[PDB]
Design an enzyme around this catalytic site. Sequence first.
Site, PDB file in Angstrom:
ATOM      1  N   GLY A   9       0.825  -1.193   0.000  1.00  0.00           N
ATOM      2  CA  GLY A   9       0.000   0.000   0.000  1.00  0.00           C
ATOM      3  C   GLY A   9       0.860   1.244   0.000  1.00  0.00           C
ATOM      4  N   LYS A  75      -7.301   0.248   1.878  1.00  0.00           N
ATOM      5  CA  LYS A  75      -8.580   0.781   2.324  1.00  0.00           C
ATOM      6  C   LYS A  75      -9.344  -0.346   3.041  1.00  0.00           C
ATOM      7  CE  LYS A  75     -12.474   1.406   0.319  1.00  0.00           C
ATOM      8  NZ  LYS A  75     -13.351   0.213   0.526  1.00  0.00           N
ATOM      9  N   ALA A  76      -9.723  -0.020   4.276  1.00  0.00           N
ATOM     10  CA  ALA A  76     -10.430  -0.930   5.167  1.00  0.00           C
ATOM     11  C   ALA A  76     -11.703  -1.515   4.557  1.00  0.00           C
ATOM     12  CB  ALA A  76     -10.765  -0.173   6.433  1.00  0.00           C
ATOM     13  N   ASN A 102      -7.795   1.485   9.197  1.00  0.00           N
ATOM     14  CA  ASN A 102      -8.692   1.740  10.322  1.00  0.00           C
ATOM     15  C   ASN A 102      -9.869   0.800  10.096  1.00  0.00           C
ATOM     16  OD1 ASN A 102      -7.601   4.390   9.125  1.00  0.00           O
ATOM     17  ND2 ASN A 102      -7.908   5.150  11.200  1.00  0.00           N
ATOM     18  N   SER A 128      -1.513   6.019  14.031  1.00  0.00           N
ATOM     19  CA  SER A 128      -2.021   7.369  14.196  1.00  0.00           C
ATOM     20  C   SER A 128      -0.897   8.380  14.000  1.00  0.00           C
ATOM     21  CB  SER A 128      -2.631   7.431  15.604  1.00  0.00           C
ATOM     22  OG  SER A 128      -3.119   8.703  15.999  1.00  0.00           O
ATOM     23  N   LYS A 183      -7.890   2.211  18.730  1.00  0.00           N
ATOM     24  CA  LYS A 183      -7.759   3.149  17.632  1.00  0.00           C
ATOM     25  C   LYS A 183      -9.076   3.890  17.385  1.00  0.00           C
ATOM     26  CE  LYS A 183      -6.581   5.248  14.004  1.00  0.00           C
ATOM     27  NZ  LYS A 183      -5.891   6.536  14.190  1.00  0.00           N
ATOM     28  N   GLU A 190     -10.783  12.391  19.672  1.00  0.00           N
ATOM     29  CA  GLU A 190     -10.314  13.454  18.801  1.00  0.00           C
ATOM     30  C   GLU A 190     -11.486  14.349  18.378  1.00  0.00           C
ATOM     31  OE1 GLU A 190      -7.615  12.267  15.462  1.00  0.00           O
ATOM     32  OE2 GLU A 190      -9.289  13.097  14.304  1.00  0.00           O
ATOM     33  N   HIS A 452     -43.183  -3.504  33.696  1.00  0.00           N
ATOM     34  CA  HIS A 452     -41.812  -4.018  33.644  1.00  0.00           C
ATOM     35  C   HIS A 452     -41.105  -4.342  34.960  1.00  0.00           C
ATOM     36  CE1 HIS A 452     -41.871  -3.345  29.328  1.00  0.00           C
ATOM     37  NE2 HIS A 452     -41.770  -2.044  29.453  1.00  0.00           N
TER      38      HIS A 452
END
EC number: 1.1.1.44
Lengths: 473, 473
Positions: A9, A75-76, A102, A128, A183, A190, A452
Amino acid sequence: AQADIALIGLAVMGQNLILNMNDHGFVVCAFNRTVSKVDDFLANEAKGTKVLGAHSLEEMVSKLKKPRRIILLVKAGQAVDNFIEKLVPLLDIGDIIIDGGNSEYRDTMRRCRDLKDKGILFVGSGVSGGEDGARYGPSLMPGGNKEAWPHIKAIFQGIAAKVGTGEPCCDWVGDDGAGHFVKMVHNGIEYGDMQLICEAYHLMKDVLGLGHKEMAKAFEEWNKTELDSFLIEITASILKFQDADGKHLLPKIRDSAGQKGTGKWTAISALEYGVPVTLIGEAVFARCLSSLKDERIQASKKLKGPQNIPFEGDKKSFLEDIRKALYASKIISYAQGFMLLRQAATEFGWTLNYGGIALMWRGGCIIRSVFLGKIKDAFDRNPGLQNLLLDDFFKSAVENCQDSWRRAISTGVQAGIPMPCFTTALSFYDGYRHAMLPANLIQAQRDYFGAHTYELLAKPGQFIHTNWTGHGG
Amino acid sequence: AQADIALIGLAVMGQNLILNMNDHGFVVCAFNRTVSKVDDFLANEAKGTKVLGAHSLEEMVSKLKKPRRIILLVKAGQAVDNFIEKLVPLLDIGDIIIDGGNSEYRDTMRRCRDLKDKGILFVGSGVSGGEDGARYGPSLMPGGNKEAWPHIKAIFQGIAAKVGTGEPCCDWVGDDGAGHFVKMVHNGIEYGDMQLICEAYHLMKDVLGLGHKEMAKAFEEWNKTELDSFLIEITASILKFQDADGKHLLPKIRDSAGQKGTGKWTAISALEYGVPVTLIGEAVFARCLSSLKDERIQASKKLKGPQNIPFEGDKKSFLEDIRKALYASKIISYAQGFMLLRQAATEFGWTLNYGGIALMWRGGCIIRSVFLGKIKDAFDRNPGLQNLLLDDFFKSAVENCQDSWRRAISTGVQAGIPMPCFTTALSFYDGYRHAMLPANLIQAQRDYFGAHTYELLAKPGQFIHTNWTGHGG
């Protein structure tokens, strides 16, 4: 046998990682589906390095020393499975495939088990730090089949970013999908920090009327307090930045935030396992809200805000309140993140080292800050810590920020500034603090309309159903 | 041929539905896996009705008039598939199987396609209203293969609850999983309204110091304003209710709210399709928060709240502010709910009649209120309405509630009362109102660390990547 490892890749991330490994004395053999790119790379970026190039998967696998180690940085999704499909015929029992994309943690769990059955050691690692981070020192978060780990330790920890006291921002996270789960939580966090900064930005801009010069100044000042972080730092730079015409660039760009999936997945996981990770949830929904740009233009013409009351107070004190409101809220976000991690660990039987995870996020990654250091010694002092807020440093930090945090939220609410994450963080803080919450009314309502059943406060475990309807009819 | 329809599943919900259908002149044939229960029912609750009992699936299918119609009211998941498995050998092409359990909308999509291939007409309907509602008039929300619909119209709409102007709270919702999707959104909304009431409850209790007598009074008063709803009504009853010792029951029950899945799924769907359904999300996470009862007891001993400032103001005016804060927030919850419905419709190609859906929720179901009537004529006046907040009634209602809503939130924030849904609803309202949001800073940050590119405000569609890093190094 000559290359220590292969990487498939050759996008910029892949290229930079191979170059980093080469700089650390590892002979990497490069491969890419579009084989042209291998030549291009060898003639250009890798000209005069020790990297080998392959022109077929079979040639790449012949080049590798045993146990053959190969990294996938494609690409995942589908492609990762396709390359596994090809590679498995060509490998010996005990060879290692590493997926650095990812990927969905459940796919990694699946693939890890499947390849274990065929005697191939599989590891999924979060990587990362963007392309420049990949070049000199990424955070690497490997998980999967631990038999692989002693054979990749050297490479991974050698190219990883290192914290001032020499340690690599890379260690074995846990079994099967653990590296990939950590991850995605990293990316969830973030999102949370980015939205918090946007809310601080919005209060200074619209309540305080600060121009971008003063706002960038305020952020550089903050980057010298507890808020010292990569994101605060680049935000100061973004606010200063001038376009070709001398005017500031940020006001010219469209307020429709994109998303690539990992944030969304952290929120979805929290919902599936019943963990109240409310601020990442609000951050994800706030990106969704901004996507509705046209709808918001229409709404601004019809919906009215509060009575315009000019800020009457000291700009410097209020700017300090925003500082503390951001810091307290960030503390709650991270407490919620480690609650998810903790719950995932009991859910999948992983023994996670939380201090270890904080260290892996202390450098290399986009959320890096001095703050991760404080989290790390919270868990060093007590690795069985149930929640970050119970740690004396964090407890004292929140107590200290408390009425500035409340003052900033009230003023924002009066002025009509959207603060989804500042307000979730406070609501959660006040929820978590209360030994008794109004959820007993939920329980009474559910027993009322759908039988319930409920528990009494004294005698947990015995379930009761009151016949509310007519108690005397 | 004698029974017009069969129902499998003789729990109280199933029993009450058969009795309702019998009272409406339909010969129902009952069946249950534990066949004993069929006898029991015929000797007891159904003694002297027109219902037939079966002792084997084969006998049940012989009893049915053609097209044979059979309802499954078993536990969602595996069992529904197992009964389908058995039934399909026994049915003719053009017979109808109806699943009334609270099934996953994707399973219903799957099953609908599969059975369509075998010429069997499948419909998944949400059923709402608890056991007593099932007895006299449920909301029924059927979706799936529309060829079934003319053959069940009479039964479904005849036993459904009816709104004052005669219409049934039941109509065809749409293709494949639409009925079940509408059903889960119904429950998502239910969660939202319950949490809003809990927050109002918490402000009166802890800010105003109101005892449950006065609090029940306040709720009965509110049930005579725009907040007229089944949930406000039963809440007044719950607050009054006295235990065997003369003391109030609600303060004795444990504040750990349970969940059965549908709320969680509404939040997860919103996240998957990128719809900012923030208040249902907060309601789900608030139930998760209350589950952590032991953790909260520990936290109350360590974490400190704000400085205790006694409420200095008029209790009556503040109680009015809480009224308006609940009403405005409920408006935002429902606007978000119909945003999800709208997005699901473009996602799966369903042509939903939103006014129709509101009517199906106006009676029979737990969220029933006068408020659903106002939503219905918002969509009658304009069925292409993009968002409920743009409708003049709702826009005027929110404008009217606005500074009471802000005042209630500020006081709650000062006093330290957790208000996750009141605050999400305001944050969303202020987000949606703003033509320009700080999400442009998100976009600038993402372009800075991971080159994701951004659009300029003038010229949407062209993506740019600035080299921020060193603009002159």
